[PDB]
Design an enzyme around this catalytic site. Structure first.
Site, mmCIF file in Angstrom:
data_model
loop_
_atom_site.group_PDB
_atom_site.id
_atom_site.type_symbol
_atom_site.label_atom_id
_atom_site.label_comp_id
_atom_site.label_asym_id
_atom_site.label_seq_id
_atom_site.Cartn_x
_atom_site.Cartn_y
_atom_site.Cartn_z
ATOM 1 C CB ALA B 15 -0.949 0.000 1.208
ATOM 2 C CB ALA B 38 9.627 0.519 11.118
ATOM 3 C CE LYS B 78 -8.964 -13.733 -9.750
ATOM 4 N NZ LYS B 78 -9.176 -12.610 -8.798
#
Ligand SMILES: N[C@@H](Cc1c[nH]c2ccccc12)C(=O)O
Ligand SMILES: N[C@@H](Cc1c[nH]c2ccccc12)C(=O)O
Lengths: 528, 528
Positions: B15, B38, B78
């Site tokens: 994201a 982090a 897919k």
């Protein structure tokens, strides 16, 4: 019971009634017996009807009728836009545009869709430039090619027949109704019966069992279509469905109209409907062949019928004592529910709003389209009825809101009427749109700027009937603009630079069409 | 008050890097972007499934060719989601049980059902099924995909031509890496690897700055929270409540891993598998030489140990040695996605099990809406409110659709399946079901041209879950209308001519089955 609908009875035989007969006759051809009950009314003058592009693609095309066929039989003219005159300046009701910032006080609401530039409607770029003082050109002249050719009464089609813009029609509704009556009865097997409804018999479930006429004939059907107009013979009278008056949003409820002979050879024909602001309403002008229909829509709250007759006749230089006139009192608003039980209201029996944006006929076939989409069988599944009602209520309320904005945002404060309009409240849904508009956002931006798709796919248009283009034409036209430019434009320096040629393209089309197009009159001469 | 000059993105996963890329691209050269992330223990590449607009709405926006990113991300294709064993009682197995003379499975393929005389093929199919005219399942009758998927065919010929709509299967970690390289190397996004220790807000409650573990302080005009389920900025700092929605979705956990696969001996499945389990379902996402899989379950119906056991047992894995990711996530969405100067993107904003591959979509769909509603430093409240409404509908509609997969399953063999039937569908979804049972389409697409749909985000976003999707899932599970659409009984010509449409599909299934190379075959070429 259950089983499919076998018989349908349409009560009312005007434009709505015969449109319903034609659409349903076409849609259910050979699987339903349709009868239309019609009683003689006091005849009225052909004061004119204005329409929108999808009249051909959603109605006549569906019936399998070519534009040329119905146009010739209805002596129709062309409409490329609605020209709003004197909505921003104080004064009497006159056919002549007053001066505003060095030009006539008018603006156009044209058909079509604003072009997208880098995913953003041209409207946003126009305002950005206007706001930063880079331009003083009106929104409509900057973003549409139409204003320039309309100022010169050009035809929407070249002599060779090729069309250069989206357009609609102007015609005497009575002729279209007669054309459709002949089509439905002669081509679709619809049965026409000349009789007056005397009694409507309902059953214990509240559904209509049958209708008994003044001659003693009894007509039973599985589904009844109320096309009786303002009287709402079935939906309101028999079914007792409440009618929602919406005068808290719309003050206009009356009109005085007539038809005026016109010398098209000497003065040509205007390819647009005129919406001329008055002191207590506005006046429509709908050009047809050799004459124009005109009507002063006003609020009985601010002008008596006689004052309206005088204002109207004086503006057209007519004799208020001898001019043939139609004095009308409208029923503005909509039924709480358009379809109740086995009774579906279509036309003014269902809802009505002043013809400020040419939606009257549209409402008829848009509803017929929704009826067929939600067509029931004999069990009358309530879900079909409820969804249909939702579509109709939204169709009307959005229009109601849009029209109210024409008066609410006019800068005029010169008569009690214009001042009162500003004291009314906009519906919450409309206020949210204005909030968005002021924040620089588009309002109902079209999914695509491809007009052919839009006007060629009813589902696409119905879901986005009033789009950003329409809102900007009217809001900006009246003077309401965003508080500031769309903030995302400051992050698009390349787009705001390249848009220069998008505006330039409109300018070249404006110039080229103006120099090459024949006048509307010239085209009609060859055509009709 | 001036444009947004600095943007700080907190969180650097899928994201976070999509936000940096999209925003870096959209605001190129007009905003300084820093992504703060982090460093902590990475998870296994359990796989991610996507939808067609990933390319048209995201990668195309960035200017990145499909070939470029999917090869660098070792992605597979897919064409649909294959639901296995959702209709039959039993243990969690990778093999379809028998049902009505065939395996218990149905497909939800991409694309749109074709329109026949303004009505979706789904309605014609059911009419025939209901009248004993056929016993073929909805998906095989209306889609060409089902039979070529049964043979693991490729969505494109060896020469590269595309024969169907498709999306991708890939390890999200790889895509995030790709995007990090892109955003930092080509969009000038600054990357800082540090941990947020303190968030300072101003008197208006907006975020002023964030201080890191090393003492660095970062300020910005707009803060994007991509911190995941922690919601470090939106929930913790801004204190916006997260709205749990387990009253609609019982699944709140998962046990996932990656399993090696012999593509040479077994080829590669061109679809995602959703395998019903005793207390949830399991995904199977085929990739290159391996497949990602995860058992999504309800902590209230199975313990973590029971889930690990059921999961490992179906894939014949050893609980004691198979590396496993055990996760308990929050299901629902923030009361508001964007508050003050803090916009949540990704799982920090909302989350629902990956039953319909919406996870990644939610990210760029939100990023698209953020740019559309982009503010300046005055943070116009209207832009924020509208953005929030778009996000809540985007999520809630998905939540409703997913709940229906469980609510309408016929299974009653375990507490889980029985409990799903006792939940309440949201009013909006109940209305959709009412409509469906009445023979109506649910969100029918404006056009059946999949290219317009998947090529125009505005178009798809406004009709994200369309009639095709609802029929695939509802009919697949066995929920069908109470009776055929009443309209069909009035369209004999339409119901006769429809066999040609059903026949056309049959010819496509035949020709493609005969001419298409296997997915594995195509993958070797396009990749190796
Ligand atoms: N969707 C309608 C909007 C409309 C209604 N009345 C109008 C009058 C003028 C221009 C546009 C309109 C159209 O484009 O036709
Ligand atoms: N509009 C989406 C609907 C969708 C979401 N997830 C899906 C999974 C399978 C099939 C369709 C979908 C699409 O067609 O891409």
């Amino acid at each position: 019971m259950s089983g499919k609908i076998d018989k349908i009875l349409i009560v009312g035989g005007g434009t709505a009634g015969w449109m319903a007969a034609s659409y349903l006759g076409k849609a259910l051809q050979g699987t339903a017996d349709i009868t239309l009950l019609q009683a003689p009314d006091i005849p009225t003058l052909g004061v004119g009807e204005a329409t929108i592009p999808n009249l051909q693609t959603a109605f006549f095309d569906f019936l399998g009728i070519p534009e040329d066929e119905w146009m010739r039989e209805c002596n129709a003219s062309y409409k490329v836009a609605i020209k709003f005159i004197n909505w921003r300046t104080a004064g009497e009701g006159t056919s002549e545009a007053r001066e505003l910032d060095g030009g006539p006080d008018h603006f156009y609401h044209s058909f079509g869709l604003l072009k997208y530039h880098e995913q953003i409607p041209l409207s946003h770029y126009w305002f950005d430039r206007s706001y930063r003082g880079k331009t003083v050109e009106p929104f409509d002249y900057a973003c549409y090619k139409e204003p320039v050719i309309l100022d010169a009464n050009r035809s929407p089609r070249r002599l060779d027949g090729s069309k250069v813009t989206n357009y609609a029609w102007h015609f005497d509704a009575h002729l279209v109704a007669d054309f459709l009556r002949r089509f439905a009865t002669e081509k679709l097997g619809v049965r026409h019966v000349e009789d007056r409804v005397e009694h409507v018999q309902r059953d214990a479930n509240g559904n209509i069992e049958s209708v008994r006429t003044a001659t003693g004939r009894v007509f039973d059907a599985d589904l009844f279509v109320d096309c009786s107009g303002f009287r709402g013979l079935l939906i309101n009278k028999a079914m007792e469905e409440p009618f929602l008056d919406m005068s808290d949003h719309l003050l206009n409820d009356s009109a005085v109209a007539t038809q005026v002979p016109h010398d098209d050879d000497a003065n040509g024909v205007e390819p647009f409907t005129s919406a001329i602001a008055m002191k207590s309403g506005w006046t429509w002008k709908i050009p047809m062949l050799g004459r124009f229909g005109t009507g002063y829509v006003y609020s009985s709250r601010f002008a008596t019928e006689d004052e309206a007759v005088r204002e109207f006749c004086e503006m057209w230089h007519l004799d208020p004592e001898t001019q043939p006139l139609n004095r009308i009192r409208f029923r503005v608003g909509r039924n709480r529910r358009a379809w109740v039980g086995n009774c579906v209201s279509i036309g003014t029996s269902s809802c009505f709003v002043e013809p400020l944006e040419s939606t009257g006929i549209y409402f008829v076939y848009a509803a017929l389209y929704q009826l067929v989409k939600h067509f029931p069988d004999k069990s009358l599944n309530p879900v079909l009825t409820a969804r249909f009602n939702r579509e109709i209520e939204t169709m009307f309320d959005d229009t109601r809101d849009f029209i109210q904005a024409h008066f609410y945002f006019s800068p005029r404060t010169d008569t009690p009427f214009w001042r009162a309009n500003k004291e009314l409240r906009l519906a919450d849904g409309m206020q949210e749109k204005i909030d968005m508009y002021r924040a620089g956002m588009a309002i109902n931006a079209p999914a695509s700027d491809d007009a052919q798709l839009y006007y060629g796919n009813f589902e696409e248009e119905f879901r986005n009937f009033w789009n950003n283009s329409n809102y900007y034409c009217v809001l900006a036209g009246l003077g309401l603009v965003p508080d500031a430019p769309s903030p995302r434009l400051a992050h698009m320096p390349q787009a705001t630079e390249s848009v220069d040629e998008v505006f330039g393209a409109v300018k070249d089309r404006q110039r080229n069409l103006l120099e090459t197009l024949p006048s509307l009159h010239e085209f009609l001469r060859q055509q009709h």
